[PDB]
Structure formats: C-alpha cells, structure tokens
Write a protein that binds this ligand. Sequence first.
Ligand SMILES: Nc1nc2c(ncn2[C@@H]2O[C@H](COP(=O)(O)OP(=O)(O)O)[C@@H](O)[C@H]2O)c(=O)[nH]1
Ligand SMILES: Nc1nc2c(ncn2[C@@H]2O[C@H](COP(=O)(O)OP(=O)(O)O)[C@@H](O)[C@H]2O)c(=O)[nH]1
Lengths: 93, 47, 126, 277, 185, 430, 430
Amino acid sequence: LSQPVSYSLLVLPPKKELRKKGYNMTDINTTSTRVHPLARWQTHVLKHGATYRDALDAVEEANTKHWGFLKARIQFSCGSFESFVRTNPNDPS
Amino acid sequence: LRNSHGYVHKQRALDSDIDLQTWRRMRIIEKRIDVDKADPHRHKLNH
Amino acid sequence: MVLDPSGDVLVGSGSGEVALLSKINLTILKTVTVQGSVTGICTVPHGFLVGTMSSNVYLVEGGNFRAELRLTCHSDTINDVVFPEGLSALFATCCGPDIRVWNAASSAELLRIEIAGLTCNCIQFS
Amino acid sequence: YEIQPILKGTKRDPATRKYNRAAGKGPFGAFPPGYRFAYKGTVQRTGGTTTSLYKGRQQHESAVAFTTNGAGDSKPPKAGAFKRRLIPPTEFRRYYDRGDLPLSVAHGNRPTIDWKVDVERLDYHHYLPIFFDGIRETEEPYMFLARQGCLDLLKRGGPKILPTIPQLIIPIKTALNTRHPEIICATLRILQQLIVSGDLIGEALVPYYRQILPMFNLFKSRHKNRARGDAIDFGQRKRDDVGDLVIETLQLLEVHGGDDAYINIKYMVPTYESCIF
Amino acid sequence: MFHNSYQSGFLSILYSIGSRPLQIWDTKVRNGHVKRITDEDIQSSVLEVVGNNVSTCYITCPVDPKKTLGIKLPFLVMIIKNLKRYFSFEVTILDDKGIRRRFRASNYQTTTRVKPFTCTMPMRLDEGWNQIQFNLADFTRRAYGTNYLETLRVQLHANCRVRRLYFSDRLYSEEELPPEFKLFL
Amino acid sequence: REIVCVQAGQCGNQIGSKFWEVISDEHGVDPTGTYQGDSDLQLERINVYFDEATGGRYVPRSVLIDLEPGTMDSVRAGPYGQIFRPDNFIFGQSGAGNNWAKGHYTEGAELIDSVLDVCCKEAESCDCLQGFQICHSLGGGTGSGMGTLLISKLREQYPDRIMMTFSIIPSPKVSDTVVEPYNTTLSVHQLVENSDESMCIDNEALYDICFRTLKLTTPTFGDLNHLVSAVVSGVTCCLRFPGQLNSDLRKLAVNLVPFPRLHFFMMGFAPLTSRGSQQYRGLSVPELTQQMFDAKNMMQAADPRHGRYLTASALFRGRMSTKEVDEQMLNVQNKNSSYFIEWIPNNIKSSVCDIPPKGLKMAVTFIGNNTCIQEMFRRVGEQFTLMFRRKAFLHWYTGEGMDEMEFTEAESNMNDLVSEYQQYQDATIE
Amino acid sequence: REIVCVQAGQCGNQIGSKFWEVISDEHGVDPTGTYQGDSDLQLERINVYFDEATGGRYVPRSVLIDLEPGTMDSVRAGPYGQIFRPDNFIFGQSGAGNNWAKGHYTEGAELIDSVLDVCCKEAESCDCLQGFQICHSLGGGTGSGMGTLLISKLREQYPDRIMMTFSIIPSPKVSDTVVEPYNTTLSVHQLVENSDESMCIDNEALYDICFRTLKLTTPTFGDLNHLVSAVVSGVTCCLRFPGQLNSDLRKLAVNLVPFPRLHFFMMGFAPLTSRGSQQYRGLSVPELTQQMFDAKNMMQAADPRHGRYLTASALFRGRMSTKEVDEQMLNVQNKNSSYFIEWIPNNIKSSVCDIPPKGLKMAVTFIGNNTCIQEMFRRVGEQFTLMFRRKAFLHWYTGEGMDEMEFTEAESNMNDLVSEYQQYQDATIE
Ligand SMILES: Nc1nc2c(ncn2[C@@H]2O[C@H](COP(=O)(O)OP(=O)(O)O)[C@@H](O)[C@H]2O)c(=O)[nH]1
Ligand SMILES: Nc1nc2c(ncn2[C@@H]2O[C@H](COP(=O)(O)OP(=O)(O)O)[C@@H](O)[C@H]2O)c(=O)[nH]1
C-alpha cells in the first residue's frame, strides 16, 4: 500500500582521514548496538515514481560506491522503515 | 529634499508635508545605510 | 522464444544475452547478460528462469531485470569422484575441463578450476 | 493488437513527403476526381513522528527562469538552426511539365543528357537562371536533369555567362537556405564549376558575398567522418562531406576573387585565414 | 623505449600506410579532428591534423608521458604539405651536460628567442609538398654551445598533412634514398 | 528561532487580528510599524514573530487566506491592519459556502499553489525555521477544507519541522452550522494523520469562562479572541525571553505525546479573575496551580474527572523559585493520584520564564493531554452516523464529487481513535 | 568629450524635449539658461552637452528636423523650449505623407543640405568630438527615411566616431500605422549597415511598465518619454560625473558586441515602484538586481526565457559597495546558468558612478544583448511578406521612384540577420 519516500545512509569518513584522527582501522565489528563515534547520518530524496525495487538498487549502489559503509535505512510514507546491514563487516556483496 | 550628491539635508524643508518624526526617521535610516563616514565630495558644494 | 503475460516476446541468444522485445515494432526494452548459451525460458509468478548450455540456471526478476544464479551442474560424462583423507564433508569431481568441489551436507559448491579445451581424467588428494 | 513497423530509413519514408509537397505524383498530373475525485486511501500518516532524518520531497513544482529560487534544471527551447525547411516551388518543374525544355535523358551506366539543339545558340538569359532554379529539387528525374544541364551549360557557355551573374544570386541563395545537406553539396559543386568557367567571373561575385556566404558559416563544422582516428573512409568518391567542400569553395573564391575578396570573406565568416598573403 | 634497439641508417616512426599508423602516438584533440584521407596530388593515403586552435590539437609520441624515445640519430626528416595556415612542431633533446631542452618552430614567429629551457625560431614552408631536414646537433651547438646526445619527445600541431617521419644519420641525395622513402608526384 | 503563522477563514482572521495586537503590544511595536518599546530585552528577540524591513519598519510573518475578501477587508480596515504586508493577502472570488468538498476540491486547488508560493517565499527567507502555527475552525468551509489542504501540502514539503494547530470545534449544546458533523469528521480524519499537536476550543467553554470567572455583563468576540491570543502567545513565551529553565515547542511535543495518534490537548490560562474579586486574593504559585487545574478554567466541554491525564505541561512566567513550582506539581500529582495514568512515574513538565505579561505579576499557561477528549469525538461520530444513515444533506457533497468511501473511512478511523483512547484509559500493568 | 544630438520627426522631437528637460534639471540649468546649481561637479562637465554663450546663458548642441513645423511650434512652446537656438530648427513646407520613399528621396534630398550644414557647424566647433546621438521612430515617414539618410551621410563624413540611435519599433499587438512593415524593414536594413549601437523600445512595454509597476490610472506620453529620457540619460552618466569604475560608450560597445551585426539591444531601468509600496521596501543592491532582471520590467516584447544572453551590462549610480555588485552578478549567473551563452565565461560587465539621478538614492540601467530579439525581426518579416506578395500598397513607393528590388534586398538582409542570431543561439563548445 505505502510507497518509499526517502532512504537514509550511515557512513564513515575516508580511510586516510580516519587514520589521521587516530582511530584504528580494524576492531569495527562488535555485537553491541552502538556505532562508531565518527559515523554520520545523511539522507536523500526519491522521485515520485520510485518503488521498493529502485530504492533497493540505489542502496546497493551506495554500498558498492565507497568504503566505510555498514548501515542502511529505507523510509516509507507510512512512517515505517527497515534496515540493511552487512552480514560480514568490511566485506561487500 | 535632497542635494545633488544624494544626501537628505539637515533642516526642515520649506512647505514640507511630512512631520518632524518621519524626518528624523529618514535621517537615521540614511545614516545607517551609508557606506562611508562622510561625503568624499564635500569641498565642491557651494551656497 | 517465450511470451510474457503482457504480450511482449522474450529472446535468448548464443552469446548469453537475454533481451525483451516489444510486440508492436520489435525494439529492445530490457537486457541482461548471463554466462552460457541460453536454451530454455520459464515463467514464474514473481520472475523468470533461464537455463544455459553449461548447466547453469538463473532466476531473474521482471521488475528491472537483475539476474542471480542458483544451480551448478556438470554437463558431460563425470569421470571420477574422490574424498580427502580423514575428511568427509566435501568431495571433488572431474568432468571435461572442470574440477569442482562440493559440500556433501548441503549439495553446494565453492571451488572451480577450468583449463579450456582439455579433458580431466583422474583426480586424487595429497 | 495491430503492429507498426519502424518504417524509417527505408523505401517508404513519410519524412520525404512533408518536404517538397509538389512531389509524389506520376508522369502525368493528378487523376480526375472519383478515382471524479475518487478516494485513494491514506497516503501519509507521518504526524506525531517528526524527526531530523526527514526532508522535503515535493519542493514546489517547476522553476521560473529569473525568479529568486532559480531556474533549476530548466533549459530554453532550441531555435533549430539545423532543422530542415520546406522546399519552395521551382520554375524548372513548371517549364519541364509544360514542355518548353529542349533536353531529354539518355539512359545508360553513365547517364548523359541528350540535347536536341546546339547549346551555343541558346539564349542563356532565359535558360541559365531556370536551370540553377532546379538545383533545389529532390525527386527524379528533376535532380539529374537540372544539375547535369547546369554543368553542361557552364562548360560549353563561353563569354555569354558573365552578364547572367546578377540573375543567378536568388536561386543560389534559395538553394542554400533549405538546410538539406545534399542540396548544399550539389550547390557547392556547381559553384566550384561556375567559378572557373570563363574569365572575370570571380571579380563579379565579390559584391554578392553578403547573400551567399551566410549559409557557409553554419555548415563549415559539420562532418560525416564518424570513423575513429586513423580509419579510412571508402565513400570519398561520393564527395558528401560538407565541411571539406565549403572550405575548398572558400579558398577557390579567395583565389579567383581578385584584389579585395579576403576582407569580404573575413567579414562574413569570422574564423577564416588568408590563402594568399 | 628504443634504447635497446638497433639504430643505424633510417629509423622511422610514422607511416600513413598500415593497419594502425597511430599505434605509438597519443592524440589530444579539441575543436578539431584527425583522420586519414586520400590526397589528390600524390594519390595515396595521408593523415590530416586540422583544428581551429593551433595549441590545443596535437599528437604526441610516445603515448606515456613518462617514457622517452631514446633515439641517437642526429637528423630528423619530415614530409609535410602546407595548407596555407598555421603550423608548429616541437622536439625535446638531451645534451651531454644532462639538461632537457626544447626546440620549437612556428611559421608565425617574428624573432628568435633563446632561453635556458626553450629556443623558439621561425620556419617558412614552400608551396606544395615539402621535406624538412632538421639538424639537431648543429642547432644545439649554435644555441647552447653543448653537444647533442639523443632526442626524447616529438610533437606535431595543426594544421598539416603528414606521410612519414624518420630519423637519419646523415644527409642523403635524391637517388641514394631507398624507393619507399622517396616521394613521387 | 522564528515561527510562521497562517490564518484561514473568518474565525482564523479574526483571532489572528487580536493575536497580532497582543504580540505587537508586548514588543512595543506601534501600529505604524515603528519600535516604541521601553527595554532592549524587547528588541533582542523581535525576530521570532517579526521579519525586519529596511527602514523604520517591521513586517509580520503571516499568510492570510480566505475565499471571499469581506473579513480581510474588515481586518485591513482595522486599527492594526496596516502592519500586514499587502502581498500576503490571498483571496478568491466566491465563498466556500461552509461546504468541505467545495473548499477542498474546487477553489482550494485553484488558490493552493499561490498560497504555497507565499509560504515558501516566507519559509526560505528564515535563517532557521521553527514549526508552523495555524488557526482555523473545523466547523466551517474554507477554514476546514483549505486549512487541511495546506497542512497536507506543508507536511509533504516540510516533514522535519513541527506542525501545530489551534482549532475551533462544535459545542455539545448548540450548533452554529447545520452540517458541522461532516466537516468536523473529515477535518479530524485529515488532522490526526497530518498534525503533530492540536489544541481544541469550544465557544461554549469560553462563554462559561466569561460568565462564571470574569462576570462580564456584555462580552464580545474580542474578549474570547483575547483569551485565545493570551494562551497562544503564552505557550511560545519561553522561546523568546530568558529564563531559569528553558523550553521549546519540540521539547513540549516530545514530553506530551506518548504515541503519535494521541496528540489532542486541552488548554487553560490561570490569572483570570473578576474586577470585584481581585481585592480578595494575592498572587502566589499555589493560587495559580489551583486555578490551573480547576475545570472552570479549562477551554473544553469534556471534564477531567471522567478520564486520566497521560501528560501535562505548565509554563510559568514571572520571578519565582523553582522549589514551589516543583513541589506544587508533586503535591497535585500525589493528592489526585487516581486521575493520573499509573504506568508513567511523573506526568507534569514545568518551565519557568522571567518576564511576565505587562500588568500581571505572574502568569501560567496549562496544556493537558487527557483521555476524556474521547467523549467529544464519540458525540460527533454519533451525530455523523445519525446524519449518514438518512443521507442527510448528502447531495451537496456528492455533487461536488466526493466518494462515499471517504465518509466511511473517516468515520471508521475516528471510531478507532475513540476505541484506542478507551483501551489506554482502562489499561493495567498486569 | 562632447556629444551632438539629432531629433527627427514627431516622436524624435517629443522625446528630445523631455530628454533636454531631464538633462537641464540634472545640471541645474534654469529654462532661461542661467546656472542655478548647487555643486561644482555640475559645472565641470557641462561642455559635454552644452556650448557656452557669452553671458549667463548656455545652449544645447542639438538639431531639430521635421517636414511640417507643427511639432516644432509645440516644442518651442514647451517649458524648456526657449533654451534651443532659433537657427537650429530646420523644417520644410510639405509633409512626409507617412511614406519612407517620399521622406528619403523627394523632401530628404531637398532639405538634407541645410541639416548637414547645421550638423557640420556644430561638429566642427567641438575641440574633440565624441559620438553622435540620434532619436527617431522606425514606423514613421520622415523619421525613418530622413533619419537613415542623415545617418548615412554622417557615417560618410565621420566614419571613425560613434553613431548611436534610440529607436521606436512597432508593437506586436496593435499598429499605429498601416504601412509599418515596409518602413521598419527598410530602416532596419539601413541601421544594420550604418549603426554602431541601436536600442529598441516598444510602446506596449512602456504601457505595461506604467500599469503594472507604477499603477498609473491614466498614463500619458509624457510618462513614456520620461522613462526613455531616464535610460538615455543613464547611458551617458559615466561620461560626465566621477565614479569608482569609469565607463564609456566605446567600452560598452567593445564589451557588448561580439560581432558587428549583432548590435541591437534591449533596455530596462530598475527603481520603478509605486508610492504605496515604497514604504515597505528600502532600496538595496539585491532588490535592484532582482527587479533589474525581472522580465516584467524590460522594455521589449521578446521575453528572455525564449533566448540566451550573449552579454549584458549594468551601470550603477550612487555610493555603494563593489563586493555586493560582484557577488550578486556572480550569483545570478550561477543560478540561471543555462540561459547564458557558455562559450563566454562571464557575460556581465558592471560599472559604478557616484552621482545618482536627482531624488533617488540609487539607480541602475541595464543593457542586454539577447537572441530573443530574433522573434521581433521574424514577425516583421512575416507581415512584410504577407503585404509584398500581394503588392498591397506598393504603387505609392514605386511612384516616388523606388525599384521593387530594394524591398527584396531589405527582406533578405533581415532574414539573414535572423539566421545569424539563430545560429549563435544554438552554438556549442564541441
Ligand atoms: N471563538 C470564535 N469563534 C468564531 C469566530 N468567528 C466565527 N467563529 C465560529 O466558527 C464557526 C464558523 O466557521 P467560519 O469561520 O465561518 O468558517 P468559514 O466559513 O470556512 O470561514 C462557528 O462555530 C462560529 O461560531 C471568532 O471570532 N471567534
Ligand atoms: N514612445 C513614444 N512614441 C511615440 C511618441 N509620439 C509618437 N510615437 C509613436 O511613433 C509612431 C508614429 O511615428 P511619427 O513620430 O508620427 O512618425 P513621423 O510622422 O515621421 O514623425 C507611432 O507608433 C506612435 O505611437 C512619443 O512621444 N513617445
């Protein structure tokens, strides 16, 4: 019934900047629900004709676009959302 | 109500319809929106 | 050659590309490339199935035509099957130019060795 | 249900029908007559759940070119400098259909115009402007007859071609304004033939650069050489490249023009370079 | 590149005849074009480099900017037809003092200028087809007073039709050239 | 942190005129627009409701919309009318006729693009935008239809801001319009989806305020609209003056709304007292708290004794200690414990602001979230069902073009809202 | 650096009269000719437009030409008319008959020698001569025919100076004269060869300026001629007063004209605003720039949204910052980037002058070179082709003596001008 209206993304800064600030490259995998202190939220607007399929395609494009990415969120017009995470960290696909 | 260089005079204009309060309003507004503290062509005025 | 529910015609080529053609003027609307010569197109309520000459079966979705692979089989006389010494969860088979390693519990496969134009005859584990 | 073939770039093109309305008929003329507000559910229910991860999806509609918000992604409409234009009616068609012309086509592998009267006695004032007016045609047998007759008249003309120059400017200009590349190529080839066919003709055409050369500027950059890099083109025999033709025509005009053709050509086309000094 | 090759007699790197004439050349073309066309005067295929801006459109050799030709022959010979327009070319050489120097020739230069990195000179072309014989050793000795070792870059700019570029170890007469190098009208 | 106001229809434009009089008085703005105030404290937050014009002048961040200009011409001719920007008046050429479908579908869609253009021009000019504030009646025609249309469009365009509404709702005893149940039901259906927080007022409750508390002999709509302007300007007071414990519209919403459908609130304002009585009682925090919870001082017909408070908020203006505020709110929660929902450990938020309204030593405004609001919706749904079974006056709405399924959906959704309130009223820990 | 003005025909003489009123007011010259100004800056460049007579008096370097003296007697009777030198009024004894060929060939060659004698007497008196300035309409008879004749003669005698024209052109909706297409086509043919810069104004655009922006109830030709006198006096302002970034007619031509035929420009003037609105918005550089680029305020019928800007120029008068000018012109170029021709990296030139027009704190005049001018020439060519194919009124012109081939030449030249504009609009970098 409802249709997607936006998709949210959580990313880490580039690898060189993360090394410059002094945070370890590894030890990012954990069982806790908390996130890294340098992870930033950003959001984007989908077009009117967008559906679940092309929204998921855009999420996959963001996943393969750049390093430093494990969180996703697709927001519907009814206020609900579902999250996408990597089963294995620092490993795409 | 203005001289050639574009400034709003000092004293009341003869047979002016506006009152003193709006005259003071215009003066303070114009002093607020000036870009320099004085006219760079004062010396060329005659009377 | 299989017709979709809407009326358009599906095609399958020897190069491995699958396209969708319009019923009005026969122009390409969507396209996917898969491995192996396509021999067989199926219809499922949520998508399509494509079968290839190299015994690969793909599942594609009619929404925007993305392909995924769920089948791996040999296509010629299987010559030999062996087990490792002391291990039974996996076994290796040889057939034509291919050597494959399967998982005995789940019938999956994660390894492949290919030398094109040749035939493998006997395999053994160290 | 019904099918519609692409029908483009083929023997039956509706594109050639829109231009040159006079074409399409047989050897003779035309035949004698007789031959509300429906409910669509609750689309959004986001009230009471405002958050910072939301942002606007509508963002008004469209954009004005010079408003405060900006033009957005709007673009102005194209003028259509290269759009094909309708072909004006020609006097050659009327004079050929009526039956006043003394030429007929002699078939063969190399087509040649058979002349029923000696060319040197013709009144070029009546005939030469008529033939140049037929270059604009795009239907057989008018194209070959008109252009080959133009070449034949120019080649065998002699000293009588020179006084005809003022009467030839209007057909030359009207042929170039049609924005059909093949008509442009034919006109350019005939112009190259005309320049050298006689003497004191190049000096006569200097005052008329104001009417001819404006169309040269538009098409000097169009090229058919779509081959990548070092690949050769095997259709060079046809001479269907507009840019090379216009460049060599400009150079020939400069060489045969006389003392001060360069300044006029430079005033017409800006990116020109002199070929003499 | 040519450091380990045999270098004697004639060494040619360009030729209009062939499957890939521009194999070891790179093209930087804007507001212009490059193509191979048949020539009217000599009735054979030639390359054409024509553009509205002289500086922007050119072809370089070798393709990788970090590579050097490494050719030790003293002379450079070109086969260029003038089109009554602008034309320029560059050669970069190396001397026994270890300094990379440039030699630029253009047909619209007014005065010769000598600088520690560049020596710009005028160049005039005759009507029709021309062969240009270039003496790198003499020019280097006359400009910088320093011996010549090798060339390591060749450039060509619009506009000009080209058939063959080759190096030679000395000047040769008309009859001493092999048939494939001599042009015929 | 600036708010943009929208005034729609006759009721909205009339209440708005009194609101902008009260706000202009508090910040010392002459009806010519000249600042004439008497403390710098007034100027330093003037931006919250006023935009700054170039010379000596201030302009108010408000959009006026109506379908026939009669009300607008009366307010523009009024004593403060000149302050409003001429370009901000948007009007049509024929009235809404008090019909929701006409106001929503025919002239609504005709004007709405020009209204959205004005709202966007005003919003994009702000350096940081706070929520919108809208005043309209739910029983009318252009108020209900165009107000809810505009609310839906702004929620599409600004989903991250706050949406706040003040709304007039039909009295339980006497109707002002014959077709009120349809317009009210459709508007409440639209609001419960679109709105973040909505306040509801009965004119009958204001009449009881006037007669019992102020004992006015001859009240006029100016008095009712002054009471409303007092509470509306009071809720935002902490936004625009310093204080010991700051508060904000978003923080109010976060503390008041437990679940997103439960966003309908009651309002009250305390230092109401008749000209004869003031000699008998000095101002103090206990007196304000006692008036604050007295149902005589509440602006809705439903009474708290039949429901329970999920949450409440009190905003205090004046120079006072935090100890008395905190202990009064504790004592009221402890003494009346059966009327407070037991699975929330503390239902009242307090806030304190230093600067009272002129001529009062202290003031408080009260906002309350109480389940007794379900009886009002039940009454409206009953009257709707009575009218719909007989298709009462239905041809007007059907002739404009509405599907009946809209009416059955809106009735079903409101009925589910009353059921949801009833379930949470009688919920238990178990 | 002094300019000589020529006013031809009825339109030209009336616009000239209003222009010389505006200029004499700006330099503080009494209509008796006595200097009564209040700053030395007024006196120090008076030579640019005035010649010095012995006593108090100053005389303006202008020639008035017309074929019937009715207009001259009206201008001599006007409020500033006395200032003009009596010997400078040149008139014949029979009218132009609204016919271009008559105006060009029969009375033109009869009168032109006395006009050339006066123009030479005025020109040879200058110590250094700057360009000529000519005002005329293109739709009339003596204005078009004798104006273009005189322009051609002056271009023969002074080819190295500047020739500048202001020209009135037929409205797209209503004609004032039946034979307008012939006179317009022949005049544009003369101008594109002879002129250096030509400005075009539609009376319809001035009516829409007056009605929409100034809200005048009953505008008159005095208002239209004031708008024209404002732009005309603005173009020359940097010649005759100090400033932070001087500019000159030749610098305008060099920056505006990419190729010599593309010299026809549209005009606008910014601080137009009604007495009621003026209280709500102070003058500032963002406001002037926003009004300046709004097509509502531009004086041609073609709209910028159908074309692209090759170049534009803005001349600012007043004491103002350069930073605001530079950043606004950059911001406007960046936000609307598709409407600016891409093979020029920055299309707008700015200039700043210290001395505003009297009674305004600041002003800007805008000159724009836009391809949408092609629509006007195409429309005129269409109406010309409709009339000429049918020989609609040609016998009058042929009876004066014109060959029919002139009409086909003028049509062809205008059609080529349209083609050149269309080609440069759709050009690309490749
Ligand atoms: N409190 C108050 N109520 C009002 C006022 N004006 C109208 N109303 C009420 O609002 C309802 C009429 O709605 P109305 O504003 O006329 O709707 P509209 O026609 O769409 O603008 C009735 O219940 C009136 O009693 C006012 O100034 N104050
Ligand atoms: N803007 C403006 N246009 C004018 C004025 N007087 C006449 N016109 C227009 O000019 C055209 C008439 O041309 P006119 O000057 O009479 O030509 P003439 O007879 O040769 O002098 C018509 O379009 C008139 O509307 C004027 O004072 N101002």
